[PDB]
C-alpha cells in the first residue's frame, strides 16, 4: 500500500479509534503504548487515510489531545527492464 | 517527534554492500533489507527529508544507468493536531 | 532490556474485538493485527512470559473449542553476553 | 520463519556483522542505532540463528561488548479444520 497514517493520542481512545480503523476498510494496523498510544495504518489510497483522520479528529480532537500525520509514496527514481516471461 | 521519513529501494542483490554503506554514511537511523533471490528491498528510516534524498540521489546517480531499481519516499506531514503542555512538560 | 516476548495469534476475523480487549487487559506493550479476509493475525509484544501466557490461555480456553486458530510464542533467552559498566553507567 | 536472533553491540561492528549475516544464508535483517546498534534476524531454522551467534561471539565478544538473544517459536494452542479445497 502507498500511504501511511500515524495517530498519536490519549490511551483512553484505544477502543474507539481501533473501531474507526476497522470500519474504514483498512487491512490492519499497529498500536503501541508510547499515557499515550500510537497507531500506524497502511492504506491502498490517500483518500482512505484522510477519511480515517477526519473521522478521528472531528469526533475527538476538540476534547482530547492528539496528532495525526500522513504520507503518500512518491517515486523519486526508476529503471525497469523486462522480457516476455517477466513483465 | 514527527515520524521518520521512509525511503524504499528495490534493486539488484549485487548492490547490497554499496547501498548499505551509502545508508550508513547518510546518518540514517536504520534500515531493513530483505531478498525479494535476484532482488533486494531496503526500507530506510531517516530523521530528515534531505538525508533520504541524499541516499536516493547517491544510489540512482551511481547505479541506475546500469542496474534496475526503484526508489520511493514517504515523508510525513501533520494533518491534525491538538496538544497541551504546562510548566513541567513543554 | 531483554527483547519483548512475542505472541502470535491467527484466528477467525469475528474475534477481533474480543481478542484486542484481552491483549489490552493483559498489560501488553502493543500489537499488530492484519487480515490474512476470513482470518486475522495478531503479533503481540509483552514484557513478561507470564503476560503472553495469560493472553494465550484466555483466548484458547474461551474460543478454541468453537473457532479455529493457532497461538505461538517466541521468548528470548540470552545466548552470549559481554557487558561493561562504570560509575556513571550501570 | 520460526526463529529470531537479536544482537545488540558496538556501532563499530556494523559492516562486519552485516557480512556475517549475508554469508549465513539468512533472507534479510533489520539494523538500527539504539553508540550501539541492534540487529534482528529471522531464520528458518534454530541452527542457522545459533551459527550466526557463534560466529559473531567467537570473532568479537572477547574484545567488544554485546549481547545476543535467541528465540524459537513454540506452539501453545491449535485448532484446525479443513476440507478438500482448503487443506
Ligand atoms: Na472532542
Ligand atoms: Na574479540
Q: How far is D71 from C2, CA to CA, in rounded Å? A: 11
Resolution reading in Å: 1.8
Interface test with C, best of D69, D75, D86 (most C CBs within 10 A): D69
Provide the experimental method for this PDB entry: X-ray
Q: How far is D29 from B42, CA to CA, in rounded Å? A: 10
Q: What total number of domains does chain D contain?
A: 1
Nearest Cβ partner of A14 from C24, C40, C45? C24
Which chain A residues contact residue B53 at CB under 8 A?
A: 76
Show the cell assigned to C55.
493472553
Show the cell assigned to D2.
520460526
The conformation of residue B70, written as its DSSP 8-state character, comes to: E
Per-residue three-class SS string for D27-56: CEEEEEECCEEEEEEEECCHHHHHHHHHHH
Q: How far is D53 from B48, CA to CA, in rounded Å? A: 34
Q: How far is C51 from C55, CA to CA, in rounded Å? A: 7
Residue listed under C-alpha cell 491534525: B80
Residue C14, CA distances (Å) to A39, C31, C68, C69, D80 in order: 21, 17, 11, 12, 16
Show the cell assigned to A10.
490519549
User: Residue B43 belongs to what domain range?
Assistant: 1-90
Q: How far is C76 from C5, CA to CA, in rounded Å? A: 7
Nearest Cβ partner of B30 from D15, D22, D31? D31
Q: In what order do the strands lie in the sheet with B30-35?
A: A74-79, B69-74, B5-12, B39-46, B30-35, D28-33, D36-43, D3-10, D66-72, C77-82
* Interface residue A34 vs chain B (CB under 8 A): no
Amino acid at each position: 500500500p502507498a500511504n501511511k497514517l500515524v495517530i498519536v493520542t490519549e490511551k483512553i481512545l484505544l477502543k474507539k479509534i481501533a473501531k474507526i480503523i476497522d470500519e474504514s476498510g483498512a487491512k490492519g494496523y499497529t498500536v503501541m503504548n508510547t499515557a499515550n498510544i500510537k497507531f500506524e495504518i497502511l492504506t491502498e489510497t490517500r483518500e482512505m487515510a484522510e477519511e480515517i483522520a477526519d473521522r478521528v479528529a472531528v469526533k475527538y480532537f476538540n476534547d482530547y489531545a492528539g496528532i495525526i500525520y500522513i504520507c503518500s509514496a512518491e517515486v523519486l527514481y526508476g529503471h525497469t527492464f523486462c522480457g516476455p516471461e517477466g513483465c
